[model samples]
Target: RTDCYGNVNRIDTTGASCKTAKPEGLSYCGVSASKKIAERDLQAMDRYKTIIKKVGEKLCVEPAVIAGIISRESHAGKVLKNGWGDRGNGFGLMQVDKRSHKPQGTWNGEVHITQGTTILINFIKTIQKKFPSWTKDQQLKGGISAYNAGAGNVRSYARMDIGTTHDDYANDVVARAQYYKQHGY
Candidate 1:
């Protein structure tokens, strides 16, 4: 069973809260795109849209929806590594958890792109099954929340009919989806 998250787990930054900067390997460097928008030299954001589209088509979901998740999680594959505090919990393009990461076979090694995409696609399909009756808005919201907090937790909330008072997880994703829709990703 999963443990409940307390306020401590919520990432709130006060003035004096001890927060580490970005991870060491993330130089946060990339190339700028040309105005002509060549087929080979697509922008990172556009390239992300295409990748998300591939994943979405494979999993039967909207491209924008996947784009939104990627946008919030890794800013379209630009972020390759991230860790919280001294805990080496997450890493790689999709920030797969090192602590509990499932091995994807020898082809993927410990953590690789194959592992990341496999987990991400599995998540999309899982949420689709969990929220069968949800509309696009509802699906996007609950699905994204489930992506973070677990599908069981999100289903529990729906089963209990609890009001969404805290962060509207689906809405968070919807907002990102809106951005991706408007911004070309």
Candidate 2:
């Protein structure tokens, strides 16, 4: 469960109130996209839109949101980076980590898209159930944060400010998702 601060509270067996808000602006160095990268990502968005649509519908998640994650996680599948650090290994468009999923498998973009959306949906529902007072947008944002930083690190008022590096990631995804939504992707 989560704390009052919206951080995952691991110490409390039944969960408890922690007054600490999420630490803000923890240094997060992310990828710097070039024009070529942007072009590639746009192409990837188009290439994967159908899969995203179907997976999004199956998971009751927004296709734009899935696209946003793809944009952030793997740069719309143009880049391949693992999760965590060198010791960690993640794969494909969704970057499914070995920490949470099975070991090596084929690099199937469709499976990655479906699995990623499922993870996002699970996080969204988990946060919503834990914080019933939070708005739908807040829950979605929190879920995004959880996707990047784990559900425990999410703060109660992330919409106010990106409380952590993970929050920064989540906010970026949300912003991109909004862009995709406006552009009809």
Candidate 3:
């Protein structure tokens, strides 16, 4: 099972494995940790469904996509932190950089969600403008990558053939998005 911080726990442990040596990523053979975690995540996502749908409609993105992004960024709001990332300026669920946007408190989950969704939408538009020939999927991948790394990074890597396939962040987000869809989250 996973903890509130998204760390997988060993069956032998009473709590999270942080107290031991390096905590290994949960390896699911047949049974899975993700199935259980996904349920918890679904419940959390449900709490913000209305807002997610509203913002997603305004931004021309699907609510499940927004939930996927949230699931990846903060594990469906289980983990909360301020001044994240290298510069120590990121905050909340989406880790909005304070240097670029107004600083938001960790307590304001809605503000973080709204701001992050808007940022993703803007990134999608920006990618569309930069690569006019790209498909919708490519554009979304670029936007998701930009949301994690930056626009410049994804733009440089984005091209006619490869697109954002090289972006681990975007790939993970897309996988979660697909998972949400499959599970009816």
Candidate 4:
């Protein structure tokens, strides 16, 4: 996410090319090296994995689930901040919505992330308690739907066994979850 600062850099339709590999232990690199950096954590693959792991551990949720949520909600910090602008209901690193995560009456950005974490943590805890028989995949699928559509909505979706096919609900989150499990954060 660093500005070029007159550093050597290049870009193409997909992304910038790395003329040389970055030297070990050096944070800064030549312009061409910087261009290859992802807007996140110098585009280091391990850095991205660390961020997801930290957040997931803090929330007691699966890193794969966290990555899936991020992928579906914001593409791992690729949206809203850079150019898409603030997407209504889909904001920040988690794509948490106001009604879902904002405090009962507050809708501010600070409140969103704060309350969102609480919701996520509670979800993980709740699933562990009530669905002890559910597998990890089942727990994650239910939890993600709960995050997206609310626990009440998720309950209904489960009871109906086929809710909101319009958005592909469970399947979509599962797909993202699988992607993250294989690709890391």
The candidate that achieves the highest lDDT relative to the unseen native structure: 2
Model 1 off-target regions past 4 Å? 1-43, 82-87, 103-133, 155-168
TM-score of each: 0.51, 0.69, 0.67, 0.54
Give one digit per residue, the lDDT tens place, for model 4 in 27-76: 44432222222223223324356655665555555565555455445545
Over the stretch 1-185, how does candidate 1's per-residue lDDT look in tens digits? 01111111122111110111112122221111111111122355474455555555554455555555554445544544332213445554345666667534332122344465556456545665776665434444444566555566666434311233233334434444544444553
Better of 1 and 4 by TM-score: 4
> What's each prediction's clash count?
1, 1, 0, 2
Evaluate all candidate structures by whole-model CA lDDT and list the values in order: 0.42, 0.57, 0.56, 0.44
Q: Which regions of candidate 4 deviate over 4 angstroms? A: 1-47, 82-87, 99-117, 126-136, 156-165
Poorest stretch of ten by lDDT in candidate 3: 1-10
As for candidate 4, its clashing pairs are 8-31, 38-43
Q: What root-mean-square deviation over C-alphas does model 3 reach?
A: 10.1
Tens digit of per-residue lDDT, candidate 2, span 77-109: 555533332345767677777778763434446
Residue 81 C-alpha lDDT in model 2: 39
| Deviation in Å, model 1, residue 55 alpha carbon | 2.1
Question: How does model 4 score by TM-score?
Answer: 0.54
Candidate 2 Cα misplacement greater than 4 A, ranges = 1-40, 81-88, 103-105, 159-167
lDDT of 4 at 3: 16
